[PDB]
Enzyme design. Structure first.
Site, short mmCIF file in Angstrom:
data_model
loop_
_atom_site.label_atom_id
_atom_site.label_comp_id
_atom_site.label_asym_id
_atom_site.label_seq_id
_atom_site.Cartn_x
_atom_site.Cartn_y
_atom_site.Cartn_z
CG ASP A 6 38.68 -40.52 17.49
OD1 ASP A 6 38.59 -40.94 16.31
OD2 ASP A 6 37.90 -40.88 18.39
CG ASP A 8 39.78 -43.83 13.01
OD1 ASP A 8 40.94 -43.94 13.46
OD2 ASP A 8 38.79 -44.40 13.52
CG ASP A 196 37.24 -36.95 11.89
OD1 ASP A 196 37.54 -37.90 12.64
OD2 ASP A 196 36.48 -37.05 10.91
#
Lengths: 247, 252
Positions: A6, A8, A196
């Site tokens: 995850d 992005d 993140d």
């Protein structure tokens, strides 16, 4: 081993080198993203992948475990309410709130581009939503709007810039469903989640090894890297993942 | 005599049509008295009402004339000649982008919104919202209540002017009903006919209209501005009264 990413914020070098390392070594990497399928396709990423914050699980057309229903060249497993239903409930919430609730569905691609700094084409892909709506709220109205959303059965998250509305879109459940759809049970038994964002919590809770490479402070019980970003990801692959293949 | 008339709430009823307005409008026609719509609406909206030029659109941003108007003015546009008084929409939208930068927050307007969204915010049909979106001079804004004051400051700082039209703030530059009225009278074929102007309106948004005419009549629901005539009833019912009482006596 399956690696859910995850990232992005993080995956857009030595990061792509690390990714390629995993792939060349037969380790599955599954993108988990807030982005739409159209956005994911523009990145050249192949299924399986999880879109719109866990709203939808996209599988190759020829996935060996039958699930979902055909859509384009994929089979899609929908975990959340479709965008059209969220948009209809938003109209109800707006009526309750007694003031405008605006989302991407209400805005032109040109407006979305201007607000996000994306190109018009990237804005169109960001507008191609299947589950989740991005909202453009007046800060002072957030409290009232969020209550109206709950009043009409919608759920909300905050993505870093904008609030979102959806129902049943959860990264954790989507991760769990995909593992339960995996052709090789043994390979799925051990899952890693690399994220993140503090809103990657549902992801971290659905994996066996959770690693935070964001710039904030790591959620308790979530392993972290010395540096955030691409370097964080590279480090996690080099230190935590690749070694396991020597076993 | 020329009668300038604001649309919604004045010449138009509580549905956007004609009540006792028809009889009133009919008698003015029979008496050879020109009636000029002055409206916040766009040209496309005015056209859907079946109204013929000359008329003044978008709060004075544009003056539309029949193409064969006896006084040459404005630019050809199909069946019209158009006299542009205000900055064009494209320039207004550009300045809004700068204002949005100065304000450090989104400034959203009709130009940013789908016809579906505009319809939903206004209660209009999708088709009527498309016509409301066909804007040539004035932008309708959809502002956060608590962001208004900072937004308005930003608009002025980039050279724009703002108004508030009942539900939404608007942005424009050089769109003034009074100045459009003064221009059209200056462009009138027979100066004797334009020498005495009447202005009928229903809101304080019409003060510029009232200032530019020789006889101002208010047919709104509240108290009329200083120096403006009143009528017993509002809307079309007042329009009827104003024609009968305030206008006919100068024509007989």
């Amino acid at each position: 081993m399956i690696v859910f990413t995850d990232l992005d914020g993080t995956l857009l070098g030595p990061a792509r080198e690390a990714l390629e390392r995993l792939r060349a070594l037969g380790v599955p990497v599954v993108p988990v993203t807030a982005k739409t399928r159209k956005e994911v396709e523009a990145l050249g990423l192949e299924p399986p992948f999880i879109v719109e914050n866990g709203g939808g699980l996209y599988l190759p057309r020829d996935w060996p475990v039958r699930a979902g229903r055909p859509k384009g060249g994929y089979r899609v497993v929908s975990l959340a309410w479709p965008y059209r239903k969220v948009r209809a409930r938003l109209r109800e919430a707006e009526a309750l709130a007694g003031r405008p609730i605006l989302g991407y569905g209400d805005l032109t691609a040109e407006a979305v581009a201007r607000l996000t700094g994306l190109s018009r084409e990237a804005a169109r892909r960001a507008k191609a939503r299947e589950y989740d709506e991005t909202l453009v709220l007046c800060p002072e109205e957030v409290e009232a709007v969020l209550e109206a959303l709950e009043a009409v059965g919608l759920e909300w998250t905050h993505g870093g810039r904008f609030y979102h509305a959806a129902k049943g879109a959860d990264k954790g459940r989507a991760v769990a469903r995909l593992r339960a759809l995996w052709p090789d049970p043994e390979e799925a038994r051990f899952a890693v989640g690399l994220g993140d964002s503090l809103n990657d919590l549902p992801l971290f809770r659905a994996v066996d090894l959770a690693v935070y490479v964001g710039r904030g402070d790591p959620p308790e019980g979530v392993l972290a890297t010395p540096a955030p970003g691409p370097e964080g990801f590279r480090y996690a692959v080099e230190r935590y993942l690749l070694p396991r293949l020597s076993r």
